[PDB]
Amino acid sequence: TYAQTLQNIPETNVTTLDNGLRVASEESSQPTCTVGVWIGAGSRYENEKNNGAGYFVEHLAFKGTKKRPCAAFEKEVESMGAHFNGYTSREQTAFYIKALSKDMPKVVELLADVVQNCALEESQIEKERGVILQELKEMDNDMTNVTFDYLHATAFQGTALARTVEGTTENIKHLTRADLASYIDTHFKAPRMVLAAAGGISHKELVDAARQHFSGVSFTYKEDAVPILPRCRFTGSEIRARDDALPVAHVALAVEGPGWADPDNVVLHVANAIIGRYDRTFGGGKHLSSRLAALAVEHKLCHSFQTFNTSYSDTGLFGFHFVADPLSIDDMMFCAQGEWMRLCTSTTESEVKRAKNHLRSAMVAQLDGTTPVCETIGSHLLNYGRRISLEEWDSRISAVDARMVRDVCSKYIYDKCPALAAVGPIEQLLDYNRIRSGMYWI
Amino acid sequence: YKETWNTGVILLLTLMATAFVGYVLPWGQMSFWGATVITNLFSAIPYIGHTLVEWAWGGFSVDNPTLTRFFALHFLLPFAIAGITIIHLTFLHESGSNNPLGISSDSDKIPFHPYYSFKDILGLTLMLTPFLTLALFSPNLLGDPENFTPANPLVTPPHIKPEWYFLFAYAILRSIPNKLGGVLALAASVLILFLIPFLHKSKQRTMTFRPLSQTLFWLLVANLLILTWIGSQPVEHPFIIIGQMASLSYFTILLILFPTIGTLENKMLNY
Amino acid sequence: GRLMDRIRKWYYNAAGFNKYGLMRDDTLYEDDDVKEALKRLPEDLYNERMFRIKRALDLSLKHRILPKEQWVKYEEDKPYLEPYLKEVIRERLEREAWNKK
Amino acid sequence: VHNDVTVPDFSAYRREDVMDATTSSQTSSEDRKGFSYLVTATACVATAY
Amino acid sequence: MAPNIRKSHPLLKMINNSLIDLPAPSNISAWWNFGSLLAVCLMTQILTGLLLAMH
Amino acid sequence: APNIRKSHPLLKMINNSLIDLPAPSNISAWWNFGSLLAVCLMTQILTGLLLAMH
Amino acid sequence: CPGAEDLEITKLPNGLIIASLENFSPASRIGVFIKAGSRYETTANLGTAHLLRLASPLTTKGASSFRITRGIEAVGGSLSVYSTREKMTYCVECLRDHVDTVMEYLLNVTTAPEFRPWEVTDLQPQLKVDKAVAFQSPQVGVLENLHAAAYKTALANPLYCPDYRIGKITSEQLHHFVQNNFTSARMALVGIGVKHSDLKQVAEQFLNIRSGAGTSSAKATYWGGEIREQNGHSLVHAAVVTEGAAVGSAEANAFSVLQHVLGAGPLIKRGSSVTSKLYQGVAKATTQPFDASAFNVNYSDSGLFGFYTISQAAHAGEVIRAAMNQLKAAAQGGVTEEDVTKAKNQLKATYLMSVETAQGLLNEIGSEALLSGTHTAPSVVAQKIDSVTSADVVNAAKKFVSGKKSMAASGDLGSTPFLDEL
Amino acid sequence: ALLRQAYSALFRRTSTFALTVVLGAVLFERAFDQGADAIFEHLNEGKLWKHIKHKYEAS
Ligand code: HEM
Ligand code: HEM
Ligand code: HEM
Ligand code: HEM
Ligand SMILES: CO/N=C(/C(=O)OC)c1ccccc1COc1cc(C)c(I)cc1C
Ligand SMILES: [Zn+2]
C-alpha cells in the first residue's frame, strides 16, 4: 500500500571524502547494478575559445587512459559485460557504468581512471575531430533540438547558457590537446563530483574503493572552493530560422525559470502536468484530458507538443514546444498561449488532483532501474545538495492546490516578455508583439 | 437560424421606428398627436426618463425642434435598414434557406436562377397589383382623415389611433392602465420575438407535421387580428375587457402554450 | 388500457408525414446530436433515409403527396435512428457530467 | 551548422538596466513595464477626457 | 484564376454568389418570396422617399 | 474554428480587414491618409446630421 | 516493515494463469499477456491484429471510449498494447492505491470490446500513420521483408497492416479474431506490485469468453526467399539469416551465445567492439563507417538467425561479405574457449539487467507464465546458459553456413550482393 | 518605487488597469479644467464679465 511503500524505500547513504569528493548509494536486493561519476561540469563552465571541450572530452573519455589504452580499456570493459555510458550537458557531465554488483569495486577503478588519468592520445583526437564534426551535421537535423538550442541562444544571449553543448564548428576544428587537458584539469575535481551507485552494493564496500582510487588530496583551501558561476541574463526575445523547404515547423516559447533550489519548481511541474504532452499517436485522441491536447485533435493543431520545466542552478526555462504544419502554427500557438493563461486564471481542483496523480507516477517512473536511480542521485546531490526521497517529493506535491498553481504560474508567466524559437516554414507565427500580448487576459 | 432571426427582429424595430417618424412629417393632426401620445410614454420611466423626453423633443412639447430632427431621422433610418438587411442576408447565406418540410435540402437543391428569380418576380406582381389597386383607386382607404387637418396643439382629435400596422401594439399598450406597465407591454409585445428561438421544444422544425401547434399558431394569428381591431376602438366596455384578454392570450401563447404543446407534441410521437 | 396507443396512433396520422413517405425519424430536425447519429447509420439505412427525403422534397415542390396505398402505417414505421440517437445523447450526457467533477 | 549562429549585440538598443549580461532582468522587469504601462494608462485618461 | 467572369470578379462574385448560383431548396413555397419583396419594397420606399424629400 | 473571430461571419470582417490584415512592414506616413479619409467621413456624416437636425 | 516476498502462480480450470509477485514498489503494473498476432492472420484478414492493437481505447460493454481514457488519466494511470507476430500484451501502470481502478478498464479492454462499426472506421486511417512513423526507421523496413522472404506463412506475415488492407478491415474481423484467439488457455494475467490473492480474485470472478484454445496457428513453414527494396538511400540496411532455433528449444542458448561471440549490441558509448568479432572483422574490410551485428529470433515453432548490416551504398558489398566469412571462420573452430567464457557473461549480464525495468521484469515473469506456466528461477537460467559447449557454438555457426539462407535489404543496392553470391 | 508599485497594484490586471483610467480620468478632468480655466482667465485679467461684474451687482 502506497502511503507505506514510500517509507520502506532504503534511505540513500552519503559520506564525503576528506578530499572534497562525495559518495552516495541506494542498496537493493539486486544482482546487477550501476555506478558513475556525476561531475558538476558543463558547456556553461566554458568560454568563447574553448566552447566544446566538455564534449570533445566526453568523446575521448573512452578511447583509453594512460594506465590502459583503447584496446585494453575497451576489451577490459566489454569482456566483463559492463556498460560504460555517459553524457554532458550545459551544467552537468556524467560517466557511469552498468554491471554485476560483483564488479562493484573493480568498476569504480575504471570510472576513476577515466576522469583523472584520461589518455588523450593526440593521434586519437584528430580522429575524434572529424567525428564530432559529423555528429553536428547529423544533430543539425533534429529540429526538436535545433530549436531548444536556438531557444537558449536568445533566451540567454550574451551569457554562458546561450551556448551549444557541442560547441562551435570552429572550436571543434581547432581545440587542442592543450585545452582538452585544461578542461579536465580545471573542471574534473573531487568536490565538484559525486560517486553514485544503486543496486546490490553496501555503502561501506563502495565508499572504500573510492577512498582507494579517489585519493587525490587537496592542500590549500582553494581546491576546496566550489567556483560560483556568473549568472546569465534572461532576455525576452525571439530568433526565427526560416526555411520553407522544411516539411514541418517547430516552435519553442518560454519564460525565465526559478532555478533548482526554489520549491515552486514543484508547482510549476504540477502545472506542466495539466497541459501535458501529445503526438499524433496518442490513442486517447479527442478524449484526452489535456485541453491543449484535445483541441490539437479537434482541429488538427499540431503533430506534437510538450511542456517543459528545464531547471538550472540559478535559472531555468519554462514553456512549451510544438511541431506543426505551416498553416496551423498560428491557431496552435494561440491555443497554447491560451491554456498557459487559463493556468494563471481559472485552474480547477480537478485539474490539479489529476496533475498530481500524474506527476507522482512520472517521478516514480524516473526511478525505474539502477541507471535511472544513480542519475537522480548523481543529480539530486550535485544540484539540490541533499537527496530528495519519493516520500518527500510526494508530500511536497500533495500540498499543492488549484489556488497555489494560479499563483505560481501567474508569478512566472503572466505579463512577462518571453523567448521565442521558430524554425522552418514559419510564415504564420509572426509578430512578437502579438505573441507578447498573449501573455495576459483569458 | 438565430442570427438571421435576430437581425430580422432589429430590421423590424428599425422599420417601425422609421415609419413612426415619417408619420410626423406631414404635420397633420394625427401626425402631431401620434407624436405626443407616444413620445409621452417615455416619461413613465423612473427618473432617467422625465428628461429623456424633453431631450427627445428638443423642447417641452412636440414642436419644430422635433419635426426637423424627426425628418433627419426619417432620412437616415431607411439606409440603416438597407445596411442591416445586408447583414441579414449574410447570416442567411451561412446556412441557406430553410424549407417547408424542415429536413436537409442538400439532397436536392436548385439554382436561385431562374427558378426563384422567376418565382420571385411573379410573387412581386401578385402583390404589387393590390398595392397599386388600392393606391390608385382608393388612396385614403387606409389613412385616417384627421391628418388632413393641419396640426393644432390646442385641439385634440376625437380619436387618436395609428395606422393599422401599429394597431395591434396600440391595443396592448392601452390594455394596461398604468403608463409604465403599458409601455413595457408594448415593448415586450414586440421585443418578445427575440425569445422565440429559446422557446422551441419540438423535435421537428416546421409545424407542417404538427397539427396541434398549427391551430395554436392560427389561434395566435387571429389573436393579432383581434388586437388590431381592439386597437381601432375606444376605451369603453366591452372593448377594454376584450382588450386585456387578447393581449393576455397573446403573451400566454408565445410564452406557455407554444413551448408546452410542443413538448406534449413530442411525446405523442413517442420521442 | 389502450388509451395511449390509440392516441399515439392518432397523432401519428394527424401529423401525416407518412403521406410523404417519411418515417418518424426522417422528419427529425438535425441538431448536433441527430447530426452525429446519422453519420453512424449503416450505409444502406442511411442511403434509404436519403432518397425518402429527396423524394419527399420533390413532392412538396410539386405540391403533391403519395397515393393513399403508399403512405406509411403507424406500425410499419421503422425507428431506425432512435437507438443510434439515445446512445449519442447518453455518451454526451456522460462526458458533460464528467467535466464538472 | 546551427551551432555557428548567435544572437547579435543589441547594446545600442537595450534599456539601461537589462544591459549587463550578469544582472537578473527579473528585478528591473516591473519597472520597465510599469513605465510604458503608465504612458499608456495615461494616454487613456487623456483620450477619455 | 477562373474561366467565366462572375466567379473571378470581386464584384460579380457578389452579384452572383447571392442571387444566381445561390443554392436554394427545390421545395420552398410562396412564403419565401417575402424576402425579396421586403427588399424590393425598401428599394422603392427609399426612392419615392427621396423624390418627396426633394420637395 | 478555435478562437471566435475567424468562425464568426461578422468578427471575421472586423478582424480580417483591421487586425490580422497582412500589411507591408515598410509603408510610410503616406499610407495613413487611407484611414484618416475614412475617419474623416465617419465624422462629417455625424456632424452633418447633428446640423441637419437644426 | 515489508521485504522479500515470493512469486505465486496459480492456474484455474479454464487454463488461465496468474503470475503474481509483490515487490513493494510504490507502483503496480498489471498486464494481460496473450498468444495472438500476425501469425494467426489469414490472407483474407491481414492486419486485423494491428488494428486491434490500436483499437484498445475503443468502447467496451463496460467502459466508454471516454471513461477509459479519462478514467485512467484521472489517476495518473496509463495503458498500452505490445505485440509480436505471436504475442500480445495489454498492460496498465499506476500508483498502488489505484490498482483495481486501473483494472476495470484493463479487464474490459481485452475481454469485452464492442468494436462499434463507426468507431472502427473512425480509426482505420490511424494505421496509415502509425505505420508511417514506424517505417521512419529502415531498421523496421528490412525486418518486415525479412520475415516475408524467410517464410511462406504465419510468421511470414507483416507486423504492420499492408497498405491495401488499410480501411478494409471489418468490425466482424476484429471480433472473430478476438473470440477466436483471446481465450483463457492462451491468456495469462501477470502483474507486479500486488498480492497474488487479489490478482487472482479478479481473474476468476471477472474473466469470461475464454475457456478454450481457440484457433490453431498455421504451422510456420520455411521458404528461403530474398526481397530487395531499391530506394536510393545513402545507407543500405541488409540482414541475412537462416532458420535458427525456437523458443524453449535446447539449441537456443547456442545462438544466443554464438550471437554474443559474434557481437550484438555495444557497451562503450561511441566506441568499438574489440570483443565483437563480427564488428571487428567487418572493420578490417570496410573503410567508411557502418554497423553490423548478430540477429537472433526465437519463435514458438521456429526461429531466425544471422547478421545485419548498415553501410555506405558502395561498401554494402564488401561489408556483407566480410560479415559472412567472419561467420564461417567462427563456424570452423575459430572460436576460442575463452571467447565463449566471456560471451557467456555478456549474456548473463544483459539478461540480468533487463529485469530492472518493470517493463522488462513484468515481461519476463509473463512470457514464461504463458509458454510454460513456470518461472525458471534465475540460477536455473544460469545453470542452463553456461551449460553450453564450444561445440554447441561452432556447430550452431555451421547450421547457418549450410542451411538455406534468405536475405532482405533496403537502400541503394547497386553494390549490394545477391543471396546466391555468398 | 512607484513604477514598481504601480505595475503591481495598477497596470497589472487589465481590470485594475481600466479601473484606474476611470478614476484617474475623473481626477484629471476635475483638475485639468481648473488649471486651464484659471490660466485662460489670468491671460484676460479684468476683461471678462466675471471681473467687471461687481460694478452693477447689488439688489
Ligand atoms: C428589414 C427587412 C427584411 C428584409 C428586406 C428581409 C429579407 C429576407 C430575405 C431576402 C430572405 C431570404 C428569402 C426569404 O424571405 O425566405 C430572408 C430570410 C429570413 N428573414 Fe428576413 N428580411 C427582413 C426582415 C426580417 C424580419 C423582421 C425577420 C423576423 C424577426 C426576418 C427573418 C428572416 C428569417 C428567419 C429568414 C430565414 C428564411 C428561411 O426560413 O429560409 N427577416 N429575409
Ligand atoms: C424605411 C422606408 C420608409 C418608410 C417605411 C417610410 C414611411 C413614411 C411614412 C410612414 C410617411 C408618412 C406618409 C404619409 O403622409 O402618409 C413618410 C413620409 C415621408 N417620407 Fe418616408 N419612408 C421611408 C423612407 C423615406 C426615405 C428614405 C425618405 C427620404 C430619405 C423619406 C422621406 C419622406 C418624406 C419627405 C415624407 C414626408 C412627406 C409625405 O408624407 O409624403 N421616406 N414616409
Ligand atoms: C472616398 C475616400 C477614400 C477613402 C476613405 C479611401 C480609403 C483608403 C484606404 C483606407 C486605403 C488603404 C490604406 C492607404 O491609404 O494606403 C486606400 C488605399 C488606396 N486608395 Fe483610397 N480612399 C479614398 C479615396 C481614394 C481616391 C480618391 C483615390 C484616388 C483616385 C484612392 C486611391 C487609392 C489607392 C490607389 C489605394 C492603394 C494604396 C496603396 O498604394 O497601398 N483612394 N484608400
Ligand atoms: C461627404 C461629407 C460631407 C461633406 C464633404 C460636407 C460638406 C459640407 C459643406 C461643403 C457644407 C457648407 C458648410 C459651410 O457653410 O461652410 C456643409 C453644410 C451642411 N452639411 Fe454637410 N457635408 C458632409 C456631410 C453631411 C451630412 C452627411 C449631412 C447630413 C445628412 C450634412 C448636412 C449639412 C448641413 C445641415 C449643412 C448646412 C448648414 C451648415 O452649413 O452648417 N452634411 N456640409
Ligand atoms: C407619430 O405618430 N405616428 C403614428 C403612426 O401610426 O405612424 C405611422 C401614430 C399615430 C396615432 C397614434 C399613435 C401613433 C404611433 O403609435 C405607435 C408607434 C409605434 C412606432 C409603435 I412600435 C406602436 C404604436 C402604438
Ligand atoms: Zn378619424
Chosen domain end from A225, A247, A262: A225
Q: Is C17 on the interface with B (CB under 8 A)?
A: yes
Q: Measure the CA–CA gap between A269 and A248, rounded to whole angstroms.
A: 28
- Residues B180 and B191: beta-carbon distance below 8 Å: no
Range of the domain at C53: 1-101
Task: For residue B88, say whether it is annotated as part of any ligand binding site.
Answer: yes
Residues 6+ apart with CB under 8 A from B191: none
> What was the experiment behind these coordinates?
X-ray
Tell me the three state secondary structure of residue B129. Answer: helix
The residue whose grid cell reads 542451411 is G403
Q: What b/e string do you get for F9-23 counting C-beta neighbours within 10 Å, with b at 16 or more?
A: eeeeeebeeeeeeee
Whether G64 contacts G9, CB under 8 Å: no
Question: What does the CA dihedral B227, B233, B236, B240 come to, rounded to 10 degrees?
Answer: 10
Instruction: Compute the Cα dihedral for B89, B94, B100, B102 and give only its sign.
Output: negative
**Do A68 and A192 fall within a single domain?**
yes
Distance from chain centroid for Cα E30: 17
Minimal C-alpha gap between F41 and chain A (Å) = 30
User: What is the C-alpha R_g of chain F?
Assistant: 16
Q: Which ligand is in closest contact with the Cα of B186?
A: 5
Of A245, A259, A348, residue with least CA distance to A309? A259
Question: How are strands ordered across the β-sheet holding A316-324?
Answer: A238-242, A419-424, A249-256, A316-324, A304-311, A277-279
DSSP type of residue B144:
-
| Closest listed ligand to the CA of B228 | 5
A254 and A187 inside one domain: no
The SS3 call for residue A152 is: helix
- Measured CA to CA in angstroms, residue G69 lies from B134, G29, G77, G175 at distances of 71, 17, 9, 22
Which subunits sit against H, judged by 3+ Cβ pairs under 8 A?
A, D
For residue A7, tell me if it sits in a domain: no
CA distance C46 to C54: 12
Which amino acid does the sequence have at A390? L
Domain count, chain H: 1
Query: How many Cβ atoms sit within 10 Å of the Cβ of residue B30?
Result: 25
User: How do beta strands A83-89 and A92-100 pair?
Assistant: antiparallel
Q: Count other Cβ atoms within 10 Å, centred on residue A163.
A: 25
CA B271/CA C28 separation, integer angstroms: 10
What are chain G's domains? 1-210 (3.30.830.10), 222-422 (3.30.830.10)
- Burial (0-12, 13-18, 19+ Cβ within 10 Å), G100: middle
- For domain D1-49, the question of CATH label 1.20.5.270 is answered with yes
Residue type, A67: K
According to DSSP, residue D3 is labeled: G
Q: From CA B55, how far away is CA B39, in angstroms rounded?
A: 11
Looking at the 3D structure of chain B, how many domains does it have?
1
* Alpha carbon distance A103, A80 (integer Å): 8
Instruction: Specify which residues A25 forms β-bridges with.
Output: A13, A197
Q: How far is Cα A91 from Cα A43, in angstroms, rounded to an integer?
A: 7
Task: Judge whether A184 lies within some domain.
Answer: yes
> Helices (DSSP H) in H1-59: which residue ranges?
2-9, 14-42
Is A138 strand, coil or helix? helix
Q: Each residue of G281-315: b (16+ CB within 10 Å) or e?
A: bbbebbeeebebbbbbbbbbbbbbbbbbbbbbbbb
CA–CA gap between residue C39 and residue G116 (Å, rounded)? 13
What the block records as the C-alpha cell of E22 is 445561390
DSSP E strands in A31-145: the ranges are 32-37, 83-89, 92-100
Atom of ligand 1 nearest to the CA of B14: 1
List Cβ neighbours of B45 (8 Å cut-off, separation of 6 or more). Answer: B52, B180, B183
d(CA G44, CA G173) in angstroms, rounded, equals 10
Give the closest residue to B243 by CA, choosing from B259, B265, B260, B228: B228
CA pair distance A83, G267, nearest whole angstrom: 4
Residue B110, helix vs strand vs coil? strand
Give CA–CA dist F6/G213, Å, rounded: 58
- Beta strands G17-19; G9-11: pairing state: antiparallel
**Distant-in-sequence, close-in-space partners of H42: CB < 8 Å, separation ≥ 6:** none
What DSSP element (H or E) covers G188? strand G187-191
List, comma-separated, the residues after which chain D is broken, a break being a C to N distance over 2.5 A; otherwise answer none: none
Could you tell me which of B23, B63, B80 has the C-alpha nearest to residue F45?
Answer: B80
* Cα–Cα distance measured from residue G39 to residue G41, given in angstroms and rounded to the nearest whole number: 5
Do A285 and A373 have their domain in common? yes
Collapsing DSSP to helix, strand or coil, A421 comes out as: strand
Q: Is the CB of B91 under 6 A from ligand 1?
A: no
d(CA G419, CA G241): 10
Ligand 5 and B160: CB distance under 6 A: yes
Q: F48 is written with which cell numbers? A: 452633418
Of the candidates A26, A27, A46, A58, the residue annotated as catalytic is A58
Interface check for H12 against chain A (CB to CB < 8 A): the answer is: yes
Residue B113 Cα, ligand 1 centroid: separation in angstroms? 19
Pairs of CB atoms within 8 A across A/G: 139
Three cell numbers at A268? 510549476
> What is the rounded (10 degree) CA torsion for B172, B178, B184, B188?
-20
Say if residue A168 is in the same domain as residue A66. Answer: yes
| A250/A346 same-domain check | yes
CATH number, domain at H1? Answer: 1.20.5.260
Domain count, chain C: 1
Q: Show the 3-state SS of B16-46.
A: HHHHHHHHHCCCEHHHHHHHHHHHHHHHHCC
Cβ neighbours of residue A261 closer than 8 Å, sequence gap 6 or more:
A384
Contact C53 B205 (CB under 8 A): no
CA angle C12, C18, C19 (to 5 degrees): 120
> How far, CA to CA in Å, does A57 sit from each of A85, A150, A174, A379, B88?
13, 23, 14, 20, 73
B200 is in an annotated binding site: no
Give the position of cell 413532392. C59
**Residue in A371, A151, A131, A362 with CA at minimum distance from that of residue A269:** A362
Alpha helices in chain B (DSSP H): 2-24, 29-39, 50-57, 64-93, 112-137, 164-175, 179-191, 211-231, 239-252, 258-268
Q: Please check whether residues A59 and A113 belong to one and the same domain.
A: yes
Residues with a CB atom less than 6 Å from ligand 4? F 44-45, 48-49, 51-52
Phi, psi (rounded to 5 degrees) for A248: -125, 180
G229 phi and psi, to 5 degrees?
Answer: -110, 90
CA distance B160 to B33: 7
Q: Looking at the DSSP assignment, which residues form a beta bridge with residue B200? A: none
CA B159–ligand 6 middle distance (angstroms): 6
Q: Which residue has the cell 478555435?
A: F2
| Three-class SS state of F8 | coil
Closest CA to A88 of A118, A119, A115, A123: A115
Contacts of C57 in chain E (CB under 8 A): 25-27
Place of cell 533496403: G410
How far apart are alpha carbons B271 and C30 in whole angstroms? 15
Joined together, the cell numbers standing for residue E11 give: 464584384
- What DSSP letter does each residue of E6-38 carry, written as one string? SSSSTTHHHHSTTTTS-EEES---GGGTHHHHH
Q: In sequence order, what are the residues at sequence separation of 6 or more whose Cβ sits closer than 8 angstroms to the Cβ of residue H7? A: D30, D31, D33, D34, D37
Using CA atoms, how far apart are residues E29 and B206, in angstroms rounded to an integer?
Answer: 13
Kindly provide the b/e burial profile for residues B54-82, where b requires at least 16 CB atoms within 10 angstroms of the residue's own CB: eebbbeeebeebbbebbbbbbbebbeebe
Residue range of the domain that includes H17? 1-59
CA-wise closest residue to D2 among A306, G293, B41, A246: A246
Query: How many domains does chain A divide into?
Result: 2
Question: Does residue A353 lie in a domain region?
Answer: yes
Run of H or E including G180: helix G171-181
Which of H3, H21, H32 lies closest to D35 in CB terms?
Answer: H3
Residue G418 is given by DSSP the state P
Looking at chain A, how many residues does it have? 442
Q: What is the DSSP string of G235-266?
A: -EEEEEEEE--BTT-STHHHHHHHHHHH--S-
Tell me which residues of B are annotated as active site: 93, 97, 119-120, 163
Burial of G224 (0-12, 13-18, 19+ CB in 10 A): middle
Could you tell me which chain E residue has the CA closest to the CA of C58?
A: E27
Report how far ligand 1's centroid is from the alpha carbon of B102 (Å): 16
- Residue A192 has what DSSP assignment? G
Asked if residues A26 and A203 have their Cβ atoms less than 8 Å apart, the reply is no
Total count of residues recorded for chain F: 54
What is the residue type of H40? Answer: F
Q: Of all helices (H) and strands (E), which one includes residue A27? A: strand A22-27
CATH number of the domain residue A120 falls in: 3.30.830.10
Q: Which residues, including other chains, have CB under 8 Å from residue B271's CB and lie 6 or more apart?
A: B203, C24, C82
CA dihedral defined by A279, A281, A282, A288, rounded to 10 degrees? 70
Q: Compute the distance between CA of residue A273 and CA of residue A270 in angstroms, rounded to an integer.
A: 5
Instruction: Give me D4's grid cell.
Output: 555557428
Which residues does residue A69 pair with via DSSP β-bridges, in sequence order? A64
**Most ligand 2 atoms within 8 A of CB, residue of B11, B23, B25 to mutate:** B25
* φ and ψ of F44, to 5 deg: -45, -50
**Residues G174, G205: contact at Cβ < 8 Å?**
no
∠ CA A227-A232-A234, rounded to 5°: 160
CA dist G143 and G159 (Å) reads: 10
DSSP string computed for G365-400: HHHHHHHTS----HHHHHHTTS---HHHHHHHHHHH
Rounded to whole angstroms, the Cα distance separating G86 from G93 reads 23
**Does residue G217 contact residue G40 with C-beta atoms inside 8 Å?**
yes
Sign of CA dihedral G400, G403, G408, G409: positive
Strand partners, G299: G246, G302
Interval between CA F48 and ligand 4 midpoint (Å): 5
Distance in angstroms between the alpha carbons of the first and the last residue of chain D: 57
List the single residue in B with minimal CA-CA distance to C54.
B107
Domain-wise residue ranges, chain D: 1-49
- Identify residue A275 by its one-letter amino acid code: I
CA distances from B115 to A200, A358, C16, G37 (A): 88, 62, 28, 60
Nearest to D23 among A162, A233, A241 (CB): A233
Measured distance CA(A342)–CA(A322) in Å, rounded: 19
Q: How far is H6 from chain D (nearest CA, A)?
A: 6
For chains B and F, count residue pairs whose Cβ atoms are closer than 8 Å. Answer: 15
Say which residues have a Cβ less than 8 Å from residue E40's Cβ, sequence separation at least 6: B124
Would the CA dihedral through A419, A432, A169, D14 be positive or negative?
negative
The DSSP code sequence of A76-89 is: HHHTTT-EEEEEEE
